[PDB]
Structure formats: C-alpha cells, structure tokens
Amino acid sequence: GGSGWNADNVDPSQCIKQSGVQYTYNSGVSVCMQGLNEGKVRGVSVSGVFYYNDGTTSNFKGVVTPSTPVNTNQDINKTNKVGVQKYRALTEWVGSRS
C-alpha cells in the first residue's frame, strides 16, 4: 500500500538552492523538512564538476545539511585565468532508497 507522501514526487533540485558559490538546505519548505522530520531522509547529496578549457575536470562531492553547507568555490584563480565552459550539478535524495 501507498503511505501517501513519497520523496519521489519531489524534485531534489528545488530542495537545495545555490547562492553565489554556496549550497544551503531549504528548510523553509515543508516538503524538505517533511522527509527529514520523519527520519526518512538525511539531507540531499550534491556534486559539482568544473570543466576547464585546459582539458581537465575536478569533481567535489559532499552532502548538504542545514548544519553543513558545501562550497564550489574551489580554485577561482584557475577559473578566472581560463574560465569554465560547462557546469553540471547532480542532486539526489539521501536516506531511504528511492
């Protein structure tokens, strides 16, 4: 039987918003704390990759929690020197499978 709310009907891309170069958990949204409050979630996993025209890629993975933010501000001097061509971010629910 269906239990009602399913973290599957909520996109994790809207649960976490990126500000400048920082990631923060949006607890101001009832759905985001709905799963965290029931203990069916532990937060949202976010990964970021910086593509450098130098043909090199860096990948930093971390978990965004209302108490632990993730900064993509890795090496801006390298990016300001050559710049970033494509930027990709992946967001998945962390906790119960599916």
For tokens 């209302």, name the residue. Answer: 66
d(CA 81, CA 4): 51
In angstroms, the Cα distances linking 66 to 2, 16, 27, 32, 43 are 29, 10, 7, 11, 8
Q: How was this structure determined?
A: NMR
- Residue 20 sits in a domain whose CATH number is 2.60.40.2290
Q: Which of 22, 24, 46, 42 is nearest to 33 (CA)?
A: 42
Cβ atoms of 94 and 43 closer than 8 Å: yes
Helix residue ranges, H only, 6-56: 12-15, 30-38
Q: What total of structural domains would you count in the chain?
A: 1
Domain that holds residue 85: 1-98
Residue 25 burial (C-beta neighbours within 10 Å; 0-12, 13-18, 19+): buried
Beta partners for residue 78, in sequence order: none
